[PDB]
Amino acid sequence: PGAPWWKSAVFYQVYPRSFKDTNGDGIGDFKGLTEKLDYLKGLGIDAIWINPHYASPNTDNGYDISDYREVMKEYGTMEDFDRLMAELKKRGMRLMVDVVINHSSDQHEWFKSSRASKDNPYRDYYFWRDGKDGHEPNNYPSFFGGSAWEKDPVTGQYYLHYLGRQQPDLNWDTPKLREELYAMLRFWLDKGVSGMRFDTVATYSKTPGFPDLTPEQMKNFAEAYTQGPNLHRYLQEMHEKVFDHYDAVTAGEIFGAPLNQVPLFIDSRRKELDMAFTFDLIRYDRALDRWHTIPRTLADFRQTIDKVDAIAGEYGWNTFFLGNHDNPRAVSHFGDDRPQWREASAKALATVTLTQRGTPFIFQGDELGMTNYPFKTLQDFDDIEVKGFFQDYVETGKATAEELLTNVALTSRDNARTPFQWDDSANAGFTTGKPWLKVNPNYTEINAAREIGDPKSVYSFYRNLISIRHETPALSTGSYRDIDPSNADVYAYTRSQDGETYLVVVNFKAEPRSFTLPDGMHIAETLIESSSPAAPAAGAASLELQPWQSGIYKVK
Numbered sequence: 001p002g003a004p005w006w007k008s009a010v011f012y013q014v015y016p017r018s019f020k021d022t023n024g025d026g027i028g029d030f031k032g033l034t035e036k037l038d039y040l041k042g043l044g045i046d047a048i049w050i051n052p053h054y055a056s057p058n059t060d061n062g063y064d065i066s067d068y069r070e071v072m073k074e075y076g077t078m079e080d081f082d083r084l085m086a087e088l089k090k091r092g093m094r095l096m097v098d099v100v101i102n103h104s105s106d107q108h109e110w111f112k113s114s115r116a117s118k119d120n121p122y123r124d125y126y127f128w129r130d131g132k133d134g135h136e137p138n139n140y141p142s143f144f145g146g147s148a149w150e151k152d153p154v155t156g157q158y159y160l161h162y163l164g165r166q167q168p169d170l171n172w173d174t175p176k177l178r179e180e181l182y183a184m185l186r187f188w189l190d191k192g193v194s195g196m197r198f199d200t201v202a203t204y205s206k207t208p209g210f211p212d213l214t215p216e217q218m219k220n221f222a223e224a225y226t227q228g229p230n231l232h233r234y235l236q237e238m239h240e241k242v243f244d245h246y247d248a249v250t251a252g253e254i255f256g257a258p259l260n261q262v263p264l265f266i267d268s269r270r271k272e273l274d275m276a277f278t279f280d281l282i283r284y285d286r287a288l289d290r291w292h293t294i295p296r297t298l299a300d301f302r303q304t305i306d307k308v309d310a311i312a313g314e315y316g317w318n319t320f321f322l323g324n325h326d327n328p329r330a331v332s333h334f335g336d337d338r339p340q341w342r343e344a345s346a347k348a349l350a351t352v353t354l355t356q357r358g359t360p361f362i363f364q365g366d367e368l369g370m371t372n373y374p375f376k377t378l379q380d381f382d383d384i385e386v387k388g389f390f391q392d393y394v395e396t397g398k399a400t401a402e403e404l405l406t407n408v409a410l411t412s413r414d415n416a417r418t419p420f421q422w423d424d425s426a427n428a429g430f431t432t433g434k435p436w437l438k439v440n441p442n443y444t445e446i447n448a449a450r451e452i453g454d455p456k457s458v459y460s461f462y463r464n465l466i467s468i469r470h471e472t473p474a475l476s477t478g479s480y481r482d483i484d485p486s487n488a489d490v491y492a493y494t495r496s497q498d499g500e501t502y503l504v505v506v507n508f509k510a511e512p513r514s515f516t517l518p519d520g521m522h523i524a525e526t527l528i529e530s531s532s533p534a535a536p537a538a539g540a541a542s543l544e545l546q547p548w549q550s551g552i553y554k555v556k
């Protein structure tokens with residue numbers, strides 16, 4: 001039995017808001033995405049995941065949805081969504097949409113009804129509780145600042161919001177609510193959608209009675225919110241009432257969950273989700289407060305990958321990504337975005353990304369080696385989470401505005417959201433108007449038109465790696481083995497299938513390094529290298545590596 005198409009595919013994530021504008025309002029749209037499908041096809045992309053594209057007041061850029069069955073006004077009409085689908089299908093490409101059902105907009109008609117009275121039939125579509133001892137029902141905090149509880153004077157109770165005030169949590173404990181969600185999913189799957197990605201999938205079940213978080217839990221609240229006791233019962237039911245009747249792949253954003261629980265979401269025998277996005281790697285260097293960085297080494301990086309791979313085992317399956325719309329840019333985060341090293345390290349990270357056991361997701365603009373943005377003031381951020389940090393840390397006197405700026409510049413989601421850099425015309429060819437978020441000035445050196453025409457570019461290297469992955473089954477579905485998990489200079493591992501073995505070797509230092517193959521192993525062939533003056537000789541038992549050198553080798 002061949003493995004399903006999604007185990008061997010290469011995905012690309014599109015953040016439609018920041019991808020391509022076609023009417024000069026400074027916001028990307030569907031017509032912009034549709035016009036650029038030949039660009040993604042030519043790169044070799046099999047499937048696209050688009051961030052939320054539904055009716056939204058955009059307090060959280062699409063993740064506050066006010067109608068699940070209509071398209072966002074800024075992106076276009078249902079006709080434009082249908083045309084997008086038809087053009088993907090022409091190119092043999094698939095669509096994964098984002099599914100945001102932990103919470104809705106406070107502007108959704110369900111919520112406008114829910115708020116009206118305790119006896120409203122929509123009351124229990126959300127969570128409403130009396131406050132305690134003069135204040136909120138409990139001490140839950142929100143990821144976006146202040147309490148996770150908001151008082152509504154219309155009834156005098158509080159409603160739950162893990163995310164923003166304008167994102168009330170949906171009440172999965174209510175059967176009528178679940179049934180409404182399942183019908184909504186069927187609405188999109190009936191249109192032929194090939195995949196669904198579940199935003200914060202691990203927080204759907206709430207703790208009965210909502211007791212206070214202990215001081216430990218408080219310091220790690222993201223984790224406590226993943227511990228609802230009905231979580232897997234809900235996911236199994238969603239599979240039985242929705243996914244079982246379609247041919248779609250399902251991927252969960254398992255944010256906050258302890259790694260050893262991940263198998264419950266993805267083990268195929270459990271009939272929950274097909275694949276996981278986990279955050280142990282991408283947050284391995286993030287403080288608990290989410291706005292400081294802690295220094296880590298390559299040893300921490302590879303050890304995390306190893307543990308994550310082990311949790312997928314025989315019946316589970318992982319995605320692999322180094323960036324998304326909620327994190328800093330891959331090259332700035334994991335490589336070295338200084339001008340002399342940006343290109344060399346962007347290539348090394350590509351090699352890593354495209355040779356992991358798992359379905360790779362390439363975040364828009366990483367194929368160009370786009371970097372973090374040079375924020376100068378707090379006013380340069382759009383992000384609602386940065387306003388939250390301002391509220392929780394600056395106004396309470398815990399940190400100065402400057403301490404916030406300096407640290408959040410490195411970590412903020414807005415680093416990923418600056419407009420895609422198409423060429424060196426005005427605003428990098430993203431828009432003819434004023435972009436909703438400023439273009440990085442480095443667009444003059446980093447842009448698609450320049451990259452595409454250059455066979456030594458980062459783009460070209462990504463295109464070649466993708467082609468090599470497509471051609472070499474061991475690189476998608478073969479086993480993974482880290483050759484030396486404690487080495488903090490040179491990342492090396494094998495991928496193996498049906499007697500064939502490939503060796504990947506990646507120098508994480510901006511300094512020359514040596515690598516000795518394990519005993520009995522010799523180089524048979526060189527598939528590709530980055531930043532290398534010469535391939536090893538057939539039979540080679542060791543390698544000399546330039547700074548940031550990467551390579552893939554068939555081994556014997």
Ligand SMILES: OC[C@H]1O[C@H](O)[C@H](O)[C@@H](O)[C@@H]1O
Binds near residue numbers: 200222255256385
């Ligand atoms: O808690 C899940 C979500 O919370 C916030 O949005 C985080 O910034 C983001 O990483 C994640 O998608």
Ligand SMILES: [Ca+2]
Binds near residue numbers: 022023026028
């Ligand atoms: Ca537009």
